[PDB]
Amino acid sequence: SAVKAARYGKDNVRVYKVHKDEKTGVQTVYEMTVCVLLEGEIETSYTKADNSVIVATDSIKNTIYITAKQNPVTPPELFGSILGTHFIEKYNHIHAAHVNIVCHRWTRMDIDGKPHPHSFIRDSEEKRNVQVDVVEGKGIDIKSSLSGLTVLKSTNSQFWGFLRDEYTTLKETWDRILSTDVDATWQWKNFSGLQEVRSHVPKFDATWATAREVTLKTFAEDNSASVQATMYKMAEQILARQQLIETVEYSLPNKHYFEIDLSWHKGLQNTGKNAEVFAPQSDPNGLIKCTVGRS
Amino acid sequence: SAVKAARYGKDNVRVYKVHKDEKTGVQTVYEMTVCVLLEGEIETSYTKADNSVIVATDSIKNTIYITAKQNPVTPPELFGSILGTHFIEKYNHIHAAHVNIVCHRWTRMDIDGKPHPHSFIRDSEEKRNVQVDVVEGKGIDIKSSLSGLTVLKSTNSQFWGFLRDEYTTLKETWDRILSTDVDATWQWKNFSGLQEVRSHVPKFDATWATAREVTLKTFAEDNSASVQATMYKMAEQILARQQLIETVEYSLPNKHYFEIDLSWHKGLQNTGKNAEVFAPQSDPNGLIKCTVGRS
Amino acid sequence: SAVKAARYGKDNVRVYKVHKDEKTGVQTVYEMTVCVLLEGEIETSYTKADNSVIVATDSIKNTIYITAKQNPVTPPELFGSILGTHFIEKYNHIHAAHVNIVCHRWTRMDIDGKPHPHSFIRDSEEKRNVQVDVVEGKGIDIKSSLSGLTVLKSTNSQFWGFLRDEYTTLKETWDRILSTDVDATWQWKNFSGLQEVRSHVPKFDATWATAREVTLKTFAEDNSASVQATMYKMAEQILARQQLIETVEYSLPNKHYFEIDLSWHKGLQNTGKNAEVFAPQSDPNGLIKCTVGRS
Amino acid sequence: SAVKAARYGKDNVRVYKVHKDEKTGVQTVYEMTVCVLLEGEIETSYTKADNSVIVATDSIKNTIYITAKQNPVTPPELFGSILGTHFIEKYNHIHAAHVNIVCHRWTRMDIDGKPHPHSFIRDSEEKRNVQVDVVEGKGIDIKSSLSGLTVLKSTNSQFWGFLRDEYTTLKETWDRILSTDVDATWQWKNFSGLQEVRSHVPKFDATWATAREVTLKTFAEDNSASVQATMYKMAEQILARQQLIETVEYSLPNKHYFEIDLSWHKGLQNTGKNAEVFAPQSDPNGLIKCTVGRS
Numbered sequence A, B, C, D: 001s002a003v004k005a006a007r008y009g010k011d012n013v014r015v016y017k018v019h020k021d022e023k024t025g026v027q028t029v030y031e032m033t034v035c036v037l038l039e040g041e042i043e044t045s046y047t048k049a050d051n052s053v054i055v056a057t058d059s060i061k062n063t064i065y066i067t068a069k070q071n072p073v074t075p076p077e078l079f080g081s082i083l084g085t086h087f088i089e090k091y092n093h094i095h096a097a098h099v100n101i102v103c104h105r106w107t108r109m110d111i112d113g114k115p116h117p118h119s120f121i122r123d124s125e126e127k128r129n130v131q132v133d134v135v136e137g138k139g140i141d142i143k144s145s146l147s148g149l150t151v152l153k154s155t156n157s158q159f160w161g162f163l164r165d166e167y168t169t170l171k172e173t174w175d176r177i178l179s180t181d182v183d184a185t186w187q188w189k190n191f192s193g194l195q196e197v198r199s200h201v202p203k204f205d206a207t208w209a210t211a212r213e214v215t216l217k218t219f220a221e222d223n224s225a226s227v228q229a230t231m232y233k234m235a236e237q238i239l240a241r242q243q244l245i246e247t248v249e250y251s252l253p254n255k256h257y258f259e260i261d262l263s264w265h266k267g268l269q270n271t272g273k274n275a276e277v278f279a280p281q282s283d284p285n286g287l288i289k290c291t292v293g294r295s
């Protein structure tokens, strides 16, 4: 037997950082969950019980807190690139670092119409994520994402003209509920190293904001022919607005809301045009994916 | 052996309702999870296998959807009172109905600064809940609550002057992070029946909004001496603003953020005045409760 | 305003303890999650910012680890009673301690048909729980429970003869699937104090084992007329076997498995006697409770 | 813009099947959660709102229940291969089916030392999984796995001789707790099609049982030098026992149990040789992976 692939490190490292402006008194908080996995010349830890090649996972955890102390933690694309670069520069035998960051929302509170200097609310479990792969001699590959964005529209969704055969019971419809949890990933052009990531820093927050805005507006305004057709329109607009993105990937569940036939009870009308009360279905769910790139 | 207490019914009934304004084209959605448990002269179903006394839980589920079709589902205090009253009026041998409703957020989307007519976002897992107990000859008891409101302040929290003995390691502090998940319940005066609940309908949404606003403002502005002292100030203000509330109960976890001593690494200063990077603790957590009523 | 009720303490305290037999080399592990909440003369911490009455929740956490170091942690009824008694004896102004313990399974591994001296497996998320209320001058009240015991029988469950009216769609059946998650609680006679709890120590593990065995055998062997009727038979047998129990409470969800009509597809027969493939329903679920006590 | 990749289908399809032996009266239940995603000539559903290429996800769901009615559902490697093959044979424009199955435990109850004919218990959240990729002209690729197997050993784990630098605080140890949740995957040789999968049917259950037994015995008996070294010994033995496996992948969290220094309290000794009470850590956790293949 041989080791074909190996990676190890620390998962679920919770980090909070506060920035205090001495001038204004305004405080800004950042909270993330970090995972760092390393690869390199470590096979002998598996095959020969040779721990001399292991950077302890406890040390990786210490490194994350030290790196957060000495560097900006925003945008997460930059923090992840700094953290990944650290390992491949510090350790001769480590050739790849894989950094995953989940950013949690702490939104400044408005009290009496004024932004509060040091009070925050978690307005939704929506996340902003980054996956950073730092590979010796191959640069920095960054995938940015938003996830956990849960939306619903109560009309202006259709689904008709699909394949009908002896397995088909679904009725065609010209008016349904559409609800999903949005997972959207944009993959950046390969960066040569940290200097190039630093040169593009302003584009990271702006592209996240554009991806979010395009997703919400397209969902709200599209008279949707299908999840497939609406998600393609989203991906096409993101690629049009940011030339440094190579691909956009959406993964969308179709969270079903079923009509309830109440006609058995006193002829109550609750289907088609008369549908008011629906049963949200926990499972099963449609799952629709696509990856859109340049011609 | 004897049956000392018995209740049964249907839990986890998901309901969606849409309201369509024909004039404006504007649609409003409501989504809830409902539980109905009944009590009454049902002991023989347990002791003698006498199913003749059982209103099937499947029928309770049907009743919830029919009631939602024929009645307003907002405010939830009113819907729960209608649903509970139904069972004790329809079934001679049912003497109490217990209705629990969890209301899920569907917040209208703003697209290009305008409210969208039919598109919604789940802005946070915060819930608005109601517990309604309808008891034959004893009226309607309503407990209203908000839950899952997650907040953090990065300064203006203290904790000193507590009991110190041979079990104590905690250092006194004049500047810490305070973060909690707010669970707040207000208990209404007993109502004689549905006519009296209907007479107070406007107070339900207004009191929920006041409870939320008082919680957020007091949390943000109090230079907190303890969770205990801040939560009492919240409860006292709610009771002052709504005379039809008898009691206010808060249940608050103290979600700890620990300083990280980095002085072992190149004398890095990250404690006290120099604290920037903290470790959020998943467990354990402080849990602080109180119930505040009138003199 | 006045404080009507107040309790505070530490939740989610994870504890592991190992016992090492020097003779045999055999090791036994215990893992629990503990919550301790205190009550007493503490109103001024809420009303006057008087922290002098507060035993810090951090100190409660330290106390749990010290108590586990110096005492047996099994049976949990005894450990909880020791821990609760500690607070009301140590602190003059604390008059009640509320101790909740969840015990996690670590079952010794069998390797090559022999019990392993120091290797364990988590065989199911079933828990053994205790709730201990220690109240100055009122003794020790103990509720013991098992929870998370998930069972299914594929036949020998019926449900017919229930109330039928204009809300009813459910068909009567003489052969269905019955599946539940068992939550069973037995409430002990009030104990005068720790000496009396110690005098009954052997009864705690034996009664837990009897409750489990009676639940499993009755579920498996009863040709069930309803959840109501089967759960009553369980409670009646537990009360018959342990005279120091006052009440037994069961809380049982009815986890529905629905027939799937496939007759639309090539006349496939999959209902009634021909039912082979079913759709487990995640929600909604029946919820059936009862409390059984002595004549 | 262009579609670079697309797949869609139905997730979270819960299925139960019962087998009834008329001779013996013995019933056997199977419960799974199924996901089917399709790929093929479907780009126009995304780009042109052309639904004519879409096999509705609702139809995929119907197909899973019909396939379960007409075929064995065990071993899951066979069921997944039948289900995947169906789509690429039935639909000219579908060129790949991706089938994921999670099998839930329903273990026959022993009542009074005898196996019960129709009563089952969920003994742990351990799963048996299959991933089946059926690709037109490329055969059937099967990955089998077990997941959610949670184990702990209280001694006979060491970790010393790792890299020490200015980021390192971890002390070397010759005696620690080791606890993990095992995720183990074995990848079969490519199969030409369903006839070849059928020819190997007996090997699927036997290899699952061998993988489980090797994992448990190696964990229990290895005087572990590291997670890395113990997991390699597991993978090497599985590959030795089944020639039709190409690779074995383990993914193991290192679930930390920390010593608690109690020496501040009356000189209590609870570290090193005197360690009895530990604090299980929920996060962070080590994460160790490896893939082992043939020379």
Ligand SMILES: O=c1[nH]c(=O)c2nn[nH]c2[nH]1
Pocket (backbone or CB within 6 Å): A008, A054, A055, A056, A057, A058, A059, D159, D170, D225, D226, D227, D228, D254, D286
């Ligand atoms: O078994 C282990 N492997 C590691 O890589 C490691 N790092 N810290 N502790 C550890 N334990």
Ligand SMILES: O=c1[nH]c(=O)c2nn[nH]c2[nH]1
Pocket (backbone or CB within 6 Å): B008, B054, B055, B056, B057, B058, B059, C159, C170, C225, C226, C227, C228, C254, C286
């Ligand atoms: O056992 C049951 N009890 C009930 O109360 C019930 N109601 N519907 N189905 C049911 N099954």
Ligand SMILES: O=c1[nH]c(=O)c2nn[nH]c2[nH]1
Pocket (backbone or CB within 6 Å): B159, B170, B225, B226, B227, B228, B254, B286, C008, C054, C055, C056, C057, C058, C059
């Ligand atoms: O606000 C607080 N209240 C308490 O009771 C406490 N105990 N430890 N820390 C604490 N903080």
Ligand SMILES: O=c1[nH]c(=O)c2nn[nH]c2[nH]1
Pocket (backbone or CB within 6 Å): A159, A170, A225, A226, A227, A228, A254, A286, D008, D054, D055, D056, D057, D058, D059
């Ligand atoms: O938008 C949809 N896409 C699909 O692929 C589908 N299948 N069933 N319903 C559906 N809705």
Ligand SMILES: [Ar]
Pocket (backbone or CB within 6 Å): A180, A219, A226, A227, A230, A231, A252
């Ligand atoms: Ar969509």
Ligand SMILES: [Ar]
Pocket (backbone or CB within 6 Å): B180, B219, B226, B227, B230, B231, B252
């Ligand atoms: Ar608070």
Ligand SMILES: [Ar]
Pocket (backbone or CB within 6 Å): C180, C219, C226, C227, C230, C231, C252
């Ligand atoms: Ar039952």
Ligand SMILES: [Ar]
Pocket (backbone or CB within 6 Å): D180, D219, D226, D227, D230, D231, D252
């Ligand atoms: Ar291991």
Ligand code: NA
Pocket (backbone or CB within 6 Å): A087, A088, A089, A090, A091, A092, A093, A094, A095, A136
């Ligand atoms: Na390197």
Ligand code: NA
Pocket (backbone or CB within 6 Å): B087, B088, B089, B090, B091, B092, B093, B094, B095, B136
């Ligand atoms: Na009545």
Ligand code: NA
Pocket (backbone or CB within 6 Å): C087, C088, C089, C090, C091, C092, C093, C094, C095, C136
């Ligand atoms: Na006392």
Ligand code: NA
Pocket (backbone or CB within 6 Å): D087, D088, D089, D090, D091, D092, D093, D094, D095, D136
């Ligand atoms: Na094909």
